[PDB]
């Protein structure tokens, strides 16, 4: 019966940790997408500035 | 034996899922920091580009 109790509690903890990890993974996806776009934009604007300074 | 096997299995799952969560959170904070670096670098490069953009 104590095992029934602790199995229920670990199932609850299991679901909660699943939710935390799932949202953390979505957050990681959004942060990496922003990282990719920002690195690309840095490369492009440094291309523009090197061309302009070459003049 | 039924209850014991069930709870030991779920405890294994708990240890592995909390393991997942720890480094998920860690790498999330690292991605956040790197995103902050991209942000500040973007602001600085745009400032340089606009100041050069006068002529």
């Amino acid at each position: 019966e104590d095992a029934d109790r602790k199995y229920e509690e670990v199932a609850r903890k299991l679901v909660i940790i699943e939710s935390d990890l799932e949202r953390a993974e979505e957050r990681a996806e959004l942060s990496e997408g922003k990282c990719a776009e920002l690195e690309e934009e840095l490369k492009t604007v440094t291309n523009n500035l090197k061309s302009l300074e070459a003049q | 034996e039924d209850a014991d096997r069930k709870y030991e299995e779920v405890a294994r799952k708990l240890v592995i899922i909390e393991s997942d969560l720890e480094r998920a959170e860690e790498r999330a904070e690292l991605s956040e920091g790197k995103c902050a670096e991209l942000e500040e670098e973007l602001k600085t490069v745009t400032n340089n580009l606009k100041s050069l953009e006068a002529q």
């Binding site: - | 294994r12 240890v15 592995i16």
Partner: protein, 371 residues
């Protein structure tokens, strides 16, 4: 007609019919002989017990396995095992049934050649074919790519496959398996005071292993836990009473898979062999191989082995790759399931080695393009 799918391996013969969902007959591949003299006349004692019958008379027999590490060493015993499988467990006549046999990669050539010669001369099967135990696992897993780790009872091997093409130069084979884990557990149980020496107490030790052993996620932390507390100790009930209690030994036994130095081997662990087989392949398929680690066979059945293996191979691989370990609950029978699927396929009916083809070309027809 119908085809037979016999998965010998070493330590468990499992056979059945092609098109079924599971093997019909599963029994140990042992052949026992009485080692005492026998006093009661009229008993009509037979001279050799094969199969599951030999497990009931363990007390008075001496058990031998006819297959050491994939390879067959006692051809007479193997002939007895095949005869038992055909006539007493399945109750079919092998004259009207094609037979699909399996073996592990990188075995001697005469093993497979003589297997063919027996299956045609002694048993007079109409056709036959020999398949690789890892390709069949990949069939039964529903993949067409992926690297498969088939840890049986005598041999462990990796076979990377991509889009149905096997890369033979990256195939690894390791002779550490369940039999060596059983011997290591027999050896380390001694440090608690229990001694199992007979070939018939090897079976008791194998049952102990199957029922109580598991893979630790962190070996050093589990070692410290067993040292400090006593929450890990479980008790087992020998065939005559005298309950034994094993603690530390529960995870020191299967840890030999990840540290083959415990039994004096120099090779690398299961995780490291898998990763080396990956890095042996081209660079364009490594991502899919990382994503499709398929485990099969009885030795992959410990609790925690998938989690441990994923943790290790994830620490090995680059941090940007998604590692997955495919561990179905019916792992132990994956080779047989895949063999049944393959033999029931329709395009496969042109791949059998017919009997006239054999009478024409000799046993060399097996390695030949009629593979």
């Amino acid at each position: 007609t119908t085809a037979l799918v016999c998965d010998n391996g070493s330590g468990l013969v499992k056979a059945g019919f092609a098109g079924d969902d599971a093997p019909r007959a599963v029994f140990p591949s042992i052949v026992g002989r009485p080692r005492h003299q026998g006093v009661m006349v009229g008993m009509g004692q037979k001279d050799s017990y094969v199969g599951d019958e030999a497990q009931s008379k363990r007390g008075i027999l001496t058990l031998k396995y006819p297959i050491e590490h994939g390879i067959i060493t006692n051809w007479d015993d193997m002939e007895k095992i095949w005869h038992h499988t055909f006539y007493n467990e399945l109750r079919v006549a092998p004259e009207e049934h094609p037979t699909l046999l399996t073996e592990a990669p990188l075995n001697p050539k005469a093993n497979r050649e003589k297997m063919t010669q027996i299956m045609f001369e002694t048993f007079n099967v109409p056709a036959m074919y020999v398949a690789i135990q890892a390709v069949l696992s990949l069939y039964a897993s529903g993949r067409t790519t992926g690297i498969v780790l088939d840890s049986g009872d005598g041999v462990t091997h990796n076979v990377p496959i991509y889009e149905g093409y096997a890369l033979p130069h990256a195939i690894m084979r390791l002779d550490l398996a369940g039999r060596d884990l059983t011997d290591y557990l027999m050896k380390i149980l001694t440090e608690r005071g229990y001694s199992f020496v007979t070939t018939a107490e090897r079976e008791i030790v194998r049952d102990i292993k199957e029922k109580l052993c598991y893979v630790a996620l962190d070996f050093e932390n589990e070692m410290a836990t067993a040292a400090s507390s006593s929450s890990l100790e479980k008790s087992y009930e020998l065939p005559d009473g005298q309950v034994i209690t094993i603690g530390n030994e529960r995870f020191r036994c299967p840890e030999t898979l990840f540290q083959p130095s415990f039994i004096g081997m120099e090779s690398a662990g299961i995780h490291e062999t898998t990763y080396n087989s990956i890095m042996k392949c081209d660079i364009d398929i490594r991502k899919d191989l990382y994503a499709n680690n398929v485990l099969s066979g009885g030795t992959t059945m410990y609790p925690g082995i998938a989690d441990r293996m994923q943790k290790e191979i994830t620490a090995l691989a680059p941090s940007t790759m998604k590692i997955k370990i495919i561990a179905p609950p019916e792992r132990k029978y994956s080779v047989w399931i895949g063999g049944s699927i393959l033999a029931s396929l329709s395009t496969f009916q042109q791949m059998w080695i017919s009997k006239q083809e054999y009478d024409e070309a000799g046993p060399s027809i097996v390695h030949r393009k009629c593979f």
